[PDB]
């Protein structure tokens, strides 16, 4: 009948996993006890986005809005424009499309409009330099997120264009049982509608923490001014630690609020980046959900990914349990033979998923 | 009626480039930071200057021919980048040049060796300079 | 307490799982400690210094890749328990079921 | 009204087809974010 | 056509001329050239 | 109303228009009443700080070595206990009022000469104008650098901060008034207000409307929300050097190069 | 006729003449440039009804399996 | 169905705006294609 879920937890993942698996799902008891029960505006907008890129899907929203029945169709893609409500930035909507774009009948060319940054959702640079590189490791050769206009909160006004030219049968099998060596640190510090000095000052704060390291540190100054700088002033910084040997990356990001010192923010992201590296084995915690899902939908082969003991947190477990409900696939974890660390190897067998929407 | 002074300095008596690829390359390899004031030797008509003017805080174009100086002026008048160009006219070996971070030059080959050492001895000299010399020199 | 078993026991909650062996994906940014604690902890870059720095035919090359993958699958399954093996790959061909 | 709309549609597809055909004949016989640098100035 | 060139140079303001001595003078022929006290008082 | 001039400090009754007291001082540049209305403090061009008492009708204390150069600016916190003085020696010095004498507390050394120093009404921000055409905002509590304002072709001559500490106005010798937001330092609007250098800009209390005076002898009334000039006031014959706004906002007092003190009252 | 009215209207708003005259904020002037433009094009003095056909065309200009069936109240 | 001939253009407000912009640009540059005495 229907695979039933509870609450608003992992709303995007459960819908995305249903779309890839093709199995209808039911999400019930969405904020039942809250004063404003049911789906939020941005959740309803996300469902509309799912339909613009699929065909033949049926989405029922209950009279109270507290229950959703989703019967997925085929992923078709194509060119479209999506208006993101101000409750969430564009990255809230761009991120799930990364899971569906390579397995589509037609190339995804989606134009997203709205706020381009927030404190809780993926930024433009997190996607461009933090997630999309993981996709290329899985065989998505051509993927691009062009930023046409930057829009900072609360008024937004930004525009990003997601273009995924690569249509593939399925992700390649992953074999990463080592700890990548970080070759250099790169990042982007950006600002809109304000003086360049803020961008320079953040770079000084970040470089202060990272100068002790033995690798090169080169942070870009992304100063936006004029018509494309959006409607509200804002600034932020994103740092990426790169491993050129196998094209791996770890990143942290944050944006500045009113009354915040640019130098302090640069130190926060630099400190968080070192926290992320210490907690990571082969991918960061913010990249781990994407890597696991792609390995689940690979060929029917045992792919291996090294994970740190710290990465096995509350979020990791719920992701695995949700995958088992949809795909029935169990992740097997084995200790590494080394004694320097307590890492583990997460071995997942692919379900033999294939891109059947693409005409041959 | 400025002929009195300009004729006392100049008499109002060259091989022009015809390949856009090299001109774009010279600017590209310069890697002009947005906060860099650039000194441009041999601006010519202004093909290279206009590209530099787009990316630079300010551009000081040093020229020796009064006729070509007007050509540069007419190409930049009434434009957003007019306020960021300072055209200088006359022999520039003798004078004390301003401070510049990058030097892009289609130098006259006659003044190649004086120019190479002027930049070297300039107080607080530029960090990078893209100069066009002959193959032997 | 093997965490692998604790993950797939739906009766236990994820919070109850972590502590014995030792919130939501809509928030993309992961949890971090406070800046003052983090700033003190990364006063020195120690504890992360380790992290920082022929086949004759094209046909045979592809066949080698397939065989190497098939060898990897066999090695992992052998390490796994026979009950663990059945739960991951399922019932392999040749099984009388 | 529909007459004008049809001409624009048929004009669009023909241009795309010739663009697609030209690419194919070309094939038989670097930076993806460079443009972002220009939009920054405005 | 030289007179047309001369008028164009004089028309523009961002032009300076070098005499044989190396001095910096404007087109008209005069030597081209804030203090806290002056601006406040 | 206390009017500081070169060589004398005179004090007037706004009602009778008759000078009540006169004090001999140096080349006074900035004067401000202390809370209670019973004391006055001057910043002379010689770097001296002079404090006067109205009831005693005499000078209480003089600090000869307050600054090495002209004390161009001087401001008081809302509590009235702390004094901030800017000088051409490129330093800001904080002073305390202890029972009355002035004690030096701290020195903030900046890169260029200082023309104006203003303290926010909530005592959270400190805006400082520099001779390098920039205005630096600090956190008064911690003295941590917060923002730098760029956009003036010529040095900023006056600064004022809105009553709710959201907007900050800057007037410069380039004849432009720029209204900035303290949240991020973005320039809301630049107004070509006057035909000459603008000497003083003040917010009307409890409102975002502000006044401006310039060397062209004009005092203009502006709307801080619509960015429009409400009223042009042509009364002075020469430069208007100083301007002051009543705490109530009922009237505005302007003094000019023509030795005339004119009171503008709201009708 | 119309030229006299156009010249008079521009002058009243300060859109014509010398600016350095010895012995209106720019934004308000741009508003005048707008209002002057629609007023002095009678075809879009006022034209007779029916000379233009804008209203019809814009109406025509305004004028996939499955979908979201939102039953929320 | 197909139509044999080009449809008669409709002069909407945008088409007017583009036309007057070209006219104003031509006047501003004083670029007139007009006959002159020889």
UniProtKB/Swiss-Prot annotation, chain A:
GO CC aspect terms: 90S preribosome; nucleolus; nucleoplasm; small-subunit processome
Annotated keywords: Acetylation, Nucleus, Ribosome biogenesis
Record-level Gene Ontology MF annotations: enzyme activator activity; RNA endonuclease activity
Pfam families: RTC (PF01137), RTC_insert (PF05189)
PROSITE patterns: RTC
Record carries keyword Nucleus: yes
Main location: nucleus
Gene Ontology process terms (BP): endonucleolytic cleavage in 5'-ETS of tricistronic rRNA transcript (SSU-rRNA, 5.8S rRNA, LSU-rRNA); endonucleolytic cleavage in ITS1 to separate SSU-rRNA from 5.8S rRNA and LSU-rRNA from tricistronic rRNA transcript (SSU-rRNA, 5.8S rRNA, LSU-rRNA); endonucleolytic cleavage of tricistronic rRNA transcript (SSU-rRNA, 5.8S rRNA, LSU-rRNA); endonucleolytic cleavage to generate mature 5'-end of SSU-rRNA from (SSU-rRNA, 5.8S rRNA, LSU-rRNA); maturation of SSU-rRNA; regulation of rRNA processing; ribosomal small subunit biogenesis; rRNA processing
Keyword presence, Zinc: no
Domain of life: Eukaryota
Compartments, as annotated in UniProt: Nucleus, Nucleolus
Subunit structure: Interacts directly with BMS1 and the U3 snoRNA to form a stable subcomplex. Component of the 90S small subunit processome also known as 90S pre-ribosome that consists of the 35S pre-rRNA, early-associating ribosomal proteins most of which are part of the small ribosomal subunit, the U3 snoRNA and associated proteins.
UniProt record similarity statement: Belongs to the RNA 3'-terminal cyclase family. Type 2 subfamily.
NCBIfam families per UniProt: 18S_RNA_Rcl1p (TIGR03400)
Misc. comment: Present with 10000 molecules/cell in log phase SD medium.
Swiss-Prot record, chain B:
Keyword Cell cycle listed: no
Gene designation per UniProt: DIM1
Subcellular location: Cytoplasm; Nucleus, Nucleolus
Lineage per the UniProt record: Eukaryota, Fungi, Dikarya, Ascomycota, Saccharomycotina
Binding annotation for S-adenosyl-L-methionine: 15, 17, 42, 63, 91, 106
Species, as recorded: Saccharomyces cerevisiae (strain ATCC 204508 / S288c)
Entry annotated with the keyword rRNA processing: yes
A GO CC annotation given for this chain: preribosome, small subunit precursor
Alphabetical UniProt keywords: Cytoplasm, Methyltransferase, Nucleus, Ribosome biogenesis, RNA-binding, rRNA processing, S-adenosyl-L-methionine, Transferase
Shown part of the complete sequence: 19 to 159 of 318
Domain of life: Eukaryota
Similarity comment: Belongs to the class I-like SAM-binding methyltransferase superfamily. rRNA adenine N(6)-methyltransferase family.
Function: Specifically dimethylates two adjacent adenosines in the loop of a conserved hairpin near the 3'-end of 18S rRNA in the 40S particle.
Protein's recorded name: Dimethyladenosine transferase
One record GO biological process: rRNA methylation
Gene Ontology MF term list: 18S rRNA (adenine(1779)-N(6)/adenine(1780)-N(6))-dimethyltransferase activity; RNA binding; rRNA (adenine-N6,N6-)-dimethyltransferase activity
From Swiss-Prot, chain D:
S-S pairs: none
Bias (Basic and acidic residues) ranges: 30-42
Localisation per UniProt entry: Nucleus, Nucleolus
Coiled coil stretches, renumbered: none
Region (Disordered): 28-42
Family affiliation: Belongs to the NOP14 family.
Record's function text: Involved in nucleolar processing of pre-18S ribosomal RNA. Has a role in the nuclear export of 40S pre-ribosomal subunit to the cytoplasm.
Assembly, per entry: Interacts with snoRNA U3. Interacts with EMG1, MPP10 and NOC4. Component of the ribosomal small subunit (SSU) processome composed of at least 40 protein subunits and snoRNA U3.
Name of the featured protein: Nucleolar complex protein 14
Gene that encodes the chain: NOP14
Residues of the full protein shown: 761 to 808 of 810
UniProtKB/Swiss-Prot annotation, chain G:
Subcellular location: Nucleus, Nucleolus
Extent of Basic and acidic residues compositional bias: 24-29
UniProt superkingdom: Eukaryota
Residue ranges, annotated region (Disordered): 1-29
Family: Belongs to the NOP14 family.
Assembly, per entry: Interacts with snoRNA U3. Interacts with EMG1, MPP10 and NOC4. Component of the ribosomal small subunit (SSU) processome composed of at least 40 protein subunits and snoRNA U3.
Function, in words: Involved in nucleolar processing of pre-18S ribosomal RNA. Has a role in the nuclear export of 40S pre-ribosomal subunit to the cytoplasm.
The name this protein goes by in its record: Nucleolar complex protein 14
Species, as recorded: Saccharomyces cerevisiae (strain ATCC 204508 / S288c) (Baker's yeast)
Gene name of the record: NOP14
Part of the whole protein covered: 4 to 117 of 810
């Amino acid at each position: 009948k229907y695979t039933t879920f509870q609450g608003s937890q992992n709303f995007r993942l459960r819908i995305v996993l249903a779309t890839l698996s093709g199995k209808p799902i039911k999400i019930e008891k969405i904020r039942s006890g809250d004063l404003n029960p049911g789906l939020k505006d941005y959740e309803v907008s996300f469902l509309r986005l799912i339909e613009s890129v699929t065909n033949g899907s049926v989405i029922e929203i209950s009279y109270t809005g507290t229950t959703v029945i989703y019967r997925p169709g085929i992923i078709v893609g194509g060119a479209s424009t999506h208006i993101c409500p101000s409750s969430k930035p564009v990255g809230y909507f761009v991120e799930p499309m990364l899971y569906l774009a390579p397995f589509s009948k037609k190339k995804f060319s989606i134009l997203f409009k709205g706020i381009t940054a927030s404190h809780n959702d993926a930024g433009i640079e997190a996607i461009k330099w933090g997630l999309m590189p993981v996709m290329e490791k899985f065989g998505v050769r051509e993927c691009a997120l062009h930023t046409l206009k930057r829009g900072s909160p609360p008024l937004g006004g930004g525009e990003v264009h997601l273009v995924v030219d690569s249509l593939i049968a399925q992700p390649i099998t992953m074999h990463e049982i080592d700890r990548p060596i970080i070759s250099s640190i790169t990042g982007v510090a950006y600002s809109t509608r304000v003086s360049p000095s803020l961008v320079n000052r953040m770079i000084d704060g970040a470089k202060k923490v990272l100068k002790n390291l033995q690798c090169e540190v080169n942070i870009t100054a992304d100063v936006w001014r004029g018509e494309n700088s959006g409607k509200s002033p804002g600034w932020g910084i994103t740092l990426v630690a790169q491993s050129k040997q196998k094209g791996w990356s770890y990143f942290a990001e944050d944006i500045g609020d009113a009354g915040s010192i640019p130098e302090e923010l640069g130190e926060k992201v630099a400190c968080q980046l070192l926290e992320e590296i210490s907690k990571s084995a082969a991918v960061g915690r913010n990249q781990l959900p994407l890597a696991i899902v792609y390995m689940v939908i690979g060929k029917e082969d045992i792919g291996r990914l090294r994970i740190n003991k710290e990465q096995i947190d509350e979020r990791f477990i719920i992701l695995l349990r949700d995958i088992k409900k949809i795909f029935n696939t169990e992740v097997f974890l084995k200790p590494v033979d080394e004694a320097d660390n307590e890492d583990m190897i997460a071995t997942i067998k692919g379900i033999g998923f294939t891109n059947t929407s693409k005409k041959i | 009626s400025a002929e009195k002074h300009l004729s006392s300095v100049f008499k109002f008596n060259q091989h022009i480039l015809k390949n856009p690829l090299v001109a774009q390359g010279i600017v590209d390899k310069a890697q002009i930071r947005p906060s860099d004031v650039v000194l441009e030797v041999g601006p010519g008509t202004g093909n290279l200057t206009v590209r530099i003017l787009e990316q630079a805080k300010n551009v000081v174009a040093v020229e020796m021919d009064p006729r070509m100086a007007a050509e540069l002026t007419k190409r930049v008048r009434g434009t957003p980048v007019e306020k960021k160009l300072e055209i200088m006219l006359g022999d520039f070996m003798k004078t004390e040049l301003p401070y510049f971070d990058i030097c892009i030059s289609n130098t006259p080959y006659q003044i190649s060796s004086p120019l190479v050492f002027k930049l070297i001895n300039q107080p607080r000299p530029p960090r990078v300079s893209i100069l066009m010399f002959q193959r032997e020199f | 307490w093997n965490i692998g078993k604790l993950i797939y026991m739906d009766n236990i909650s994820p919070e109850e799982c972590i502590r014995r062996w030792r919130v939501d994906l809509e928030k993309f940014v992961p949890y971090f400690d406070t800046f003052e604690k983090l700033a003190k902890k990364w006063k020195s870059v120690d504890a992360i210094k380790e992290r920082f720095l022929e086949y004759d035919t094209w046909y045979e090359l592809q066949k080698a890749k397939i065989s190497k993958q098939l060898e990897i699958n066999n090695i992992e399954y052998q390490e796994m328990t026979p009950e663990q093996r059945q739960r991951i790959e399922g019932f392999k061909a040749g099984s009388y079921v | 009204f529909e007459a004008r709309q049809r001409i624009e549609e048929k004009n669009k597809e023909s241009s795309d087809y010739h663009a697609k055909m030209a690419h194919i004949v070309n094939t038989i016989n670097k930076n993806k974010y460079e443009r972002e640098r220009k939009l920054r100035g405005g | 056509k030289r007179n047309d060139v001369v008028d164009t140079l004089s028309k523009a303001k961002n032009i300076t001329v070098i005499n044989q001595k190396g001095e910096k003078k404007d087109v008209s022929g005069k030597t081209k050239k804030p203090d806290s006290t002056n601006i406040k008082l | 109303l206390a009017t500081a001039s070169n060589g004398s400090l005179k004090i007037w009754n706004i009602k009778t228009h008759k000078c009540i007291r006169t004090f001999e001082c140096g080349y006074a540049l900035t004067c401000k009443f202390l809370p209670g209305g019973l004391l006055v403090i001057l910043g002379t061009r010689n770097g001296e700080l002079q404090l006067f008492d109205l009831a005693s009708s005499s000078l209480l204390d003089t600090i000869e070595d307050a600054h090495d150069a002209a004390i161009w600016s001087l401001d008081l916190t809302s509590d009235g206990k702390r004094l901030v003085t800017g000088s051409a020696d490129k330093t800001v010095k904080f002073w305390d009022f202890k029972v009355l004498k002035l004690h030096h507390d701290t020195t903030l050394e900046l890169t260029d000469d200082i023309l104006c120093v203003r303290v926010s009404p909530d005592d959270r921000y400190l805006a400082i104008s520099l001779l390098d055409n920039t205005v630096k905002v600090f956190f008064l509590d911690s003295m941590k650098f917060y923002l730098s304002l760029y956009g003036h072709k010529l040095p900023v001559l006056s600064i004022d901060i809105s009553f709710d500490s959201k907007m900050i106005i800057t007037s410069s010798a380039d004849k432009n008034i720029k209204i900035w937001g303290l949240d991020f330092g973005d320039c809301h609007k630049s107004l070509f207000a006057h035909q000459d250098s603008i000497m003083n800009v003040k917010f009307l209390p409890q409102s975002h409307n502000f006044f401006s005076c310039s060397k062209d002898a004009v005092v203009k009334y502006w709307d801080g929300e619509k960015f429009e000039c409400i009223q042009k006031l042509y009364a002075h014959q020469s430069e208007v050097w100083a301007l002051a706004v009543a705490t109530d906002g009922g009237f505005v007092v302007s003094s000019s190069h023509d030795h005339s003190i004119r009171i503008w009252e709201e009708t | 006729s119309q030229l006299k009215n156009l010249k008079a209207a521009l002058k009243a708003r300060g859109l014509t003449g010398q600016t350095n005259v010895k012995s209106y904020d720019r934004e308000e002037k741009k508003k005048a440039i707008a209002e002057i433009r629609e007023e002095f094009n009678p075809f879009e003095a006022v034209g007779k009804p029916g000379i233009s056909k804008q209203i019809g065309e814009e109406q025509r200009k305004r004028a996939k399996r499955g979908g979201v069936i939102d039953k929320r109240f | 169905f197909d139509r044999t001939a080009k449809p008669v253009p409709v002069i909407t407000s945008e088409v007017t705006e583009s036309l007057e912009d070209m006219i104003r640009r031509r006047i501003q540059d004083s670029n007139f294609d007009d006959l002159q005495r020889r």
